[PDB]
Design a protein around this ligand. Structure first.
Ligand SMILES: CN1CCC(c2cnn(-c3nccc4c(=O)[nH]cnc34)c2)CC1
Ligand SMILES: [Cl-]
Ligand SMILES: [Zn+2]
Ligand SMILES: [Zn+2]
Length: 341
């Protein structure tokens, strides 16, 4: 299924939505993982919070000023940490004449304005704030407690399993990358202006890596997995010029985005908004975690796979420890939990 590897959108009912892990296995049975990114529109009746009029006192402890350098669709992003500020102070700056969104009719027009102006007037991103906007009683798709097998690290083995908040403004960006340990991720857009994404199918990920290595040879010699530094920006026109397959999608308030193992993604914010995210796992991820290429030059996020191999692959434990496990990943295959569909 999904032989084109295009980004799929799902509209689950209230009954289908209630079981997170089962619904993840369902979208994989439909071939959603092949694109490396999927959209899930929850039922209109479901709300994770009754109101967003009570979060002005929330503190953003480490805001980052995003400085961009480059030309011809090739850029490097540098971070400057600024002093702590509240959501109220952040919203005032985000909506001010200096940083607000420019006037536009079509999305294509805004996308052109982004790629033409990303090196001028550096914006401020209220990124990686530890916290949640979900109310305590919410049991459906609660980012703060998904309860997947990723919790086996947490049970006696900065958290990858904990929630993060992202306060955006016009022209704030996220560079090309896969998740830490090639895990899955979940992103919910709570309120505000849209967030646009770019994605490369996992079956074509090595092609993006080869292109990036050719463009930045100095970075590659210093670190094998330099894309994990999250500093590299490559425009969709540069990917098209070199025949790299990719897709695009715009996420609106009240919508979920799912990233899959070894799915490269990048993107930008249209204006003032707030997103919540975390990492999660399925049984299909274990092989991805065992084979993930890690950052060498840095301190970096490293999860021991030992606990997963004992529990889910006891027959291969001895062969794995000796380094003789030569399993080849087929990126098209769905998770074993999708067997019932
Ligand atoms: C400690 N942190 C762990 C998660 C790390 C991480 C991994 N992925 N990732 C992102 N992916 C998708 C969208 C966004 C986005 O809208 N803003 C910012 N970061 C994003 C951020 C950052 C560092
Ligand atoms: Cl608000
Ligand atoms: Zn990500
Ligand atoms: Zn490195």
């Amino acid at each position: 299924l999904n032989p084109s590897a295009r980004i799929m959108t799902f509209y689950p009912t209230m009954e289908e939505f209630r079981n997170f892990s089962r619904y993840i296995a369902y979208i994989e049975s439909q071939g959603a993982h092949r694109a490396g990114l999927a959209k899930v529109v929850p039922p209109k009746e479901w709300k994770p919070r009754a109101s967003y009029d009570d979060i002005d006192d929330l503190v953003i402890p480490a805001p980052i000023q995003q400085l961009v350098t480059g030309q011809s669709g090739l850029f490097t992003q540098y971070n400057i940490q600024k002093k702590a500020m509240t959501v109220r102070e952040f919203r005032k700056i985000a909506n001010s004449d200096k940083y607000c969104t420019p006037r536009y009719s079509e999305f294509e027009e805004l996308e052109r304005k982004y790629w033409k102006n990303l090196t001028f007037n550096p914006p401020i991103y209220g990124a990686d704030v530890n916290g949640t906007l979900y109310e305590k009683h919410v049991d459906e798709w609660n980012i703060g407690r998904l309860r997947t097998i990723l919790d086996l690290v947490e049970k006696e083995s900065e958290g990858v399993n904990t929630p993060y908040l992202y306060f955006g403004m016009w022209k704030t960006s996220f560079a090309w990358h896969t998740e830490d340990m090639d895990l899955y991720s979940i992103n919910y857009l709570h309120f505000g202006e849209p967030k646009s994404w770019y994605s490369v199918p996992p079956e074509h990920g090595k092609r993006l890596e080869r292109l990036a290595k050719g463009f930045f040879p100095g970075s590659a010699q210093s670190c094998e997995a330099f894309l994990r530094h999250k500093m590299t920006l490559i425009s969709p026109l540069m990917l098209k010029k070199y025949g790299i397959p990719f897709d695009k999608v715009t996420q609106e308030a009240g919508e979920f985005m799912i990233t899959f193992p070894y799915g490269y993604h990048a993107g930008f914010n249209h204006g003032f908004n707030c997103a919540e995210s975390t990492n999660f796992a399925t049984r299909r991820w274990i092989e991805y975690g065992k084979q993930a290429v890690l950052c060498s030059c840095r301190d970096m996020v490293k999860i021991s796979m030992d606990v997963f191999v004992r529990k889910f692959q006891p027959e291969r434990y001895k062969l794995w420890k000796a380094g003789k496990d030569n399993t080849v990943i087929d990126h098209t295959l769905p998770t074993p939990e999708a067997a019932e569909f």
